[PDB]
Amino acid sequence: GSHMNLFVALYDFVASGDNTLSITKGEKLRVLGYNQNGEWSEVRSKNGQGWVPSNYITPVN
């Protein structure tokens, strides 16, 4: 991606395809970028790369 911000998962999200990424509350993330309306975020966690809903994550200060 482009930006260095740390993000963290606010809620558990379970994937439903091989392009979505399961995340658990409190998990550290990097945001690579966004989908066409910003409502999905492409992220990396320790467990891999894939898409998660944007409202399930938040930047950390």
Side-chain angles (χ1 to χ4, degrees), residues 20-55:
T20 46
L21 181 71
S22 300
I23 54 174
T24 51
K25 244 180 208 282
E27 179 162 25
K28 301 184 287 280
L29 302 170
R30 184 88 76 78
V31 173
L32 305 176
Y34 290 90
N35 74 335
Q36 74 292 338
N37 63 3
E39 293 183 355
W40 287 83
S41 292
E42 192 185 18
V43 305
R44 173 163 294 273
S45 72
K46 55 181 258 162
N47 292 315
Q49 181 173 327
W51 291 95
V52 300
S54 294
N55 70 322

